[PDB]
Amino acid sequence: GILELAGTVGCVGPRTPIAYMKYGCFCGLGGHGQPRDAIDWCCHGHDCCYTRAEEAGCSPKTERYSWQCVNQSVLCGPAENKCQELLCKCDQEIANCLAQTEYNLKYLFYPQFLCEPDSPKC
Ligand SMILES: Cc1cc(-c2cc(C(N)=O)n[nH]2)c(C)s1
Ligand SMILES: [Ca+2]
């Protein structure tokens, strides 16, 4: 869920999870368009993963799961079921993705009217 998403992103990356709450065309609730940069690509990929998790019968925004932060890296487990392992994979992946990127301040609170109606495929 969101609690573990916050946790994993701060474990691996150098910045507040607040930095990703309305950013580019994809970072935050929903999203459409051409991704503005690497960070926005990370969020498009996470959007896709969560979509996949939902199609598999999971609730990626609410379901709790255990994990450990060891040397600023995410270890998933123990998992009680398949959904917990999918969810932790999705959050691990975005966390690793975002930790490798430079932040572009200009994309924080970017106008949605500049985001195209079509998106890249998942
Ligand atoms: C608390 C956090 C939310 C997000 C987030 C991801 C997305 C997304 N994939 O659109 N939106 N907010 C982080 C990276 S930490
Ligand atoms: Ca999104």
User: So where are the chain's domains?
Assistant: 1-122
Distance (Å, whole) CA 95 – CA 60: 15
Angle 74-59-13 (CA atoms, 0-180°, nearest 5)? 25
Q: Is 28 annotated as a binding residue?
A: yes
Distance (Å, whole) CA 69 – CA 74: 5
46 flagged as catalytic? yes
Tokens of 84: 């917990």
**3-state helix vs strand vs coil in the chain, percent to 5:** 45, 5, 45
Query: Resolution, rounded to a tenth of an Å?
Result: 2.2
The yes/no answer on whether domain 1-122 falls in CATH 1.20.90.10 is yes
Angle in degrees, 0-180, between the axes of helices 82-99 and 2-12, rounded to the nearest 10: 40
Which ligand is located closest to the Cα atom of residue 46?
Answer: 1
CA of 43 to the centre of ligand 1 (A): 7
Determined by X-ray
Q: Is 26 annotated as a binding residue?
A: yes
Distance (Å, whole) CA 70 – CA 11: 8
| Exposure on the CB side of residue 3, measured as CA atoms within 13 A | 7
Residue to mutate (ligand 1; options 3, 11, 43; most atoms within 8 A of CB): 43
Distance (Å, whole) CA 46 – CA 42: 6
Tokens of 117: 């109606």
Residues with CB under 6 A from ligand 1: 2, 5-6, 9, 17, 20-21, 26-28, 31, 43, 46-47, 94
Distance (Å, whole) CA 36 – CA 20: 13
Tokens of 102: 């430079």
